[PDB]
């Protein structure tokens, strides 16, 4: 099965991604 089908089927069934933001909050240099 294709990964795009698997992702789409996951979300259409009601599957939820529930992670918090990963540990890259800070901005330096030209990041905005």
């Amino acid at each position: 099965k294709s990964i795009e089908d698997r992702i789409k089927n996951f979300f259409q069934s009601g599957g939820k991604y529930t992670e918090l933001e990963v540990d890259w909050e800070e901005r330096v240099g030209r990041e905005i």
Binding site: F11, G15, K16, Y17, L20, E21, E25, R27, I32
Partner: protein, 112 residues
Amino acid sequence: MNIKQFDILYIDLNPTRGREKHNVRPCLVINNQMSIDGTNFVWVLPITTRGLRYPTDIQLKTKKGLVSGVIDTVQIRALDLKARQYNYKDELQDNLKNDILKAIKTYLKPTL
């Protein structure tokens, strides 16, 4: 407080911790409805108050004319809408929507 692809939001971009700074900045949402609803994250490009400088800059045009500036297509970011103050403000004009996505694909397209 519900969000769709190509909405312009003001979003708190500052770190969630050890911060006093809490101003919001305008951002264009570029991920699709399926992933917004499935994850509570938005993928955004920031809107910045300059003129066109860089070849990656796209001039912002909106449906209600409330936000102006340049879309910086380089600085993509996934943000958790449950973790940050955000506010719907405007929407991208329909005629720019394919240009945004084409610009994004340009940066992901692989090479031999």
